[PDB]
RNA sequence: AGGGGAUCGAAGAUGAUCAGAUACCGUCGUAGUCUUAACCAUAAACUAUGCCGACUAGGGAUCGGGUGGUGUUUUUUUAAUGACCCACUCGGCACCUUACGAGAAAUCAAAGUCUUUGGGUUCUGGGGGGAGUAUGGUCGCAAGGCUGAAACUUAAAGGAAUUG
């Protein structure tokens, strides 16, 4: 039967969502069906900045940050220790871990 | 499948059964008297009421 | 009707107000609660103090009608009710159950804590939902202290109050035993203030 | 409205609707098409007479292993060929 | 493994419930009570009984342990239960009320001292 | 089997029949 | 119910919910019998005499056993305007 | 759209009786509504009911009580003959000692028994029991 | 001996409550079966069928048998109890106990012309239990129980003399065909007839009138 | 049929992989992907829920419009505005809780108001296959679409849940 109510995605009242491509395998997954994981990171690290710290003009300059938005697919997400799998009772929880 | 086979062994066991003939026995009553006879052995007779009122249990 | 002596006297109206009993819940409301009145800004409701008075005497009237004192049962699982439940039950039969409710205390006759109450009292329906449950399974009435967010489901006559209040829970328990004893005959003088202080039925952290 | 029309003057719809769906039945299909007349080697009859042509060694379906000893018969009234079983223990000897 | 079993958890718990004014926090004295105050079929159990007894008796020294109530323990709870201050905390220390309770009492028709201080958004 | 390529087998089949049929016509 | 000549039949004339006026089946365990004492001019209860109220399991399942008694009691006079007819 | 005001009215009456209420609002209160309820109240199933007169079509507020079991409409309104009254009362009544089949005749609206007392027939409107 | 532990079992042992009629009037739950066989000594047990049900395991299947048992005296009362156990003999005893504990009253009326000693049901009654619907239309005199043989016994044991029946769904898997009639034959005291409209003084429950006998 | 032909890319050439590999993977690669003009009429074209109308439980969020409020901010501290806040409302895409209700369960405020069986109306189905085949029409340039059987065959796959 229906495994779930939305049942793949957030498409409710559209029909079409103009899909996107997976970051790992380029699969043409629907955008609202995608598994968006915003990646935010420092430009270098939080541990190796010590070595770079003494080798910089402009003391404590910015330590800029790196941003990303990753679109995985169901096959790619499940395979790599991502949202992979839950219990039937816990699939209702829509809050992030 | 196949439509050929061993037709030469038709009637194997029927023609192989040893011939035992019917023993001579007294006639049973016909018509009303049979209902008289059957009523007697079933209802007013308690011959086979072993656990469940069997009619023809095997000899034991 | 009433002899006008059961009417709420001013010397008890300030106690309800000193315990903040009139303080209701947030803007969140249960439609099964018509006791709300004159909400403040910043989302504060207030319970009509007149209503909770005769709602209180009604509960005692049912309690007094039960012949055997020990057929009354009071249920406490919330933190703010363990001392209140035992103090009320010390002055009446009203046999108390506190701590763990061990579900199956009404059904399952072979359980150690088998009880057949003629009427139960629960402090908070949400925290005592299990106690409310079997009372709907073996034909038992329920008396509950209820705020404006209370689940009035499977609950007989309820007391509009502030279960959040620290003294509101205790005072309503106190006025519960006070009015039960008066009807039974322990307190012949209605005007007598029942010298036992209402501060007795409270909760202490140490 | 449960589907089907309920108007007091919709008997025409109901009768014609029933006619179209009656065809999904199997007995109503064969009866009105007259398939048994046009097919089913008899003529809609229960018995037919024919000439034995040969004997057959038909083998049993699962799960069963045996030979059934049937005969090919060509019918008299229409000339059609059928296969017929010879039921009893050893009765293939009488239908040579 | 050194996790004690039910027959050690329950026999020990049965002792403090009944031998609180009794055998102390020292093992070698406790085990010389158990061998005569209780019929234990095996020495190894008796040694483990006075073991978990000492462990629990060492807990009752600093604060109480929940799950154990010996009748001498709860006098703190049938004396603190009647603990009442003469200050009568429910009395008046000077009562404040918002404008909602101002006309609320007037609707009820009661004469109460109302030092009204407004609290609004 | 799967219905796409049993449906596809039949179309290559129907193509075959119209081809041999039209030779008689 | 009754036969041709008196002789009452149909044992177990059941009770009625005081609010919905429906009847209470034997297996209706979610139903409640409410006895409320009456006190006259003394403030002390009179044991044995009641103002009886019966509620079906239907209203208790819907959480209006409290509300129904608010109107029920007020109509008998043992409450006050706590229930208002106009809404 | 709305085809039968009686179907909408009686459905509202049942759904209030199913939920335990004592009142229901009826819109838009045709003539055959009052005649249907007037029969109903003569048998004690409903009791007091009130006509709110808006200038559009009218409204009806009914005061209910737990006596009623079901009150519906049979659509379409078949012509029933004096001999066919038996079939209707056997199919759609719980028993033959109580319940009434409301059917319109040339002599106004009446139950299946008043039709027999008057020996008149007509079209069928509904049923209450 | 019984030595009951229940408020009702104490009264019933004390003989203070004489008939089940008082039990049904105030909807009193019944917990132990001694209350039934001493207040209604005329109930006869009838085992309908025994069917095995198997659980799948690591290795093999373990087998337990279902035991439907219908009880009731032929005047006014019927009970249906279904219980499964390892052995058929044990399952029969346990299903008997549940059957007695499940006893419900019945309403018997007339098809019309109430001569006396009601022969049929008062109203049309329906009980749906899963796919199956079981309808019980009251019948005229001499019609008997027009019903399937397994259902027929359940209506014989409840004192119904004339009735009609109509079914739907699979009747031929009887565990809940007998629960569809039990609902229907128990819904007899749920339908409000015009001869019950009158308002009663709400008799006080025996637990409150006779509370002086409480064990502690 | 042109224009375009940067990307990717059914066929194919290779390199792999392999026992085989005419597959998955790697490097290329034409028709197409793009467009104008004209055909094609299909999709798991899915909410696998036809449309219209009625009544039946609570809760918050949001979009568009509106209503009221000495509410807040910015302008000219100060007006109007605009943007926010609170309460309510009409319409809409949805979500949360529970079952008095339904269902075969999964579940469902609709899949409820159905043996207590009737608001109006359209379309479709009658064991699984043979078979969307055969045949005859019809539309299309074609691919195919629409319509659509029978003879014959035979007790044998799941909607749903349970235990392993
Ligand atoms: Mg689409
Ligand atoms: Mg018509
Ligand atoms: Mg059938
Ligand atoms: Mg299609
Ligand atoms: Mg579709
Ligand atoms: Mg709709
Ligand atoms: Mg909205
Ligand atoms: Mg929208
Ligand atoms: Mg069919
Ligand atoms: Mg078919
Ligand atoms: Mg088979
Ligand atoms: Mg399955």
Author numbering:
A (entry chain Da): 2 to 98
B (entry chain De): 2 to 61
C (entry chain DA): 2 to 207
D (entry chain DX): 2 to 97
E (entry chain DR): 2 to 95, 100 to 126
F (entry chain Em): 1 to 25
G (entry chain DV): 1 to 87
H (entry chain DW): 2 to 130
Please give me the paper's original passages concerning this structure.
Ribosome-associated quality control facilitates the degradation of incomplete translation products and requires dissociation of the stalled ribosomes. A central event is therefore the splitting of collided ribosomes by the ribosome quality control trigger complex, RQT, by an unknown mechanism. The RQT complex of yeast is composed of the ATP-dependent Ski2-like RNA helicase Slh1 (Rqt2), the ubiquitin-binding CUE domain containing protein Cue3 (Rqt3) and the zinc-finger containing protein Rqt4. We propose that the Ski2-like helicase 1 (Slh1) subunit of RQT applies a pulling force on the mRNA, causing destabilizing conformational changes of the small ribosomal subunit, ultimately resulting in subunit dissociation.
We found RQT exclusively on the lead but not on the trailing ribosome. Along the trajectory of the swiveling motion, RACK1/Asc1 of the lead ribosome would clash with RACK1/Asc1 of the trailing ribosome. In case of intact disomes, head-swiveling of the lead ribosome would force the trailing ribosome to accommodate this movement by rotating in the opposite direction with the connecting mRNA between the two ribosomes serving as a pivot. Yet, since the mRNA connecting the collided ribosomes must be already under tension, as indicated by the incomplete tRNA translocation of the trailing ribosomes, we predict that any additional force application, extending the mRNA by only a few nucleotides, should have an immediate destabilizing effect.
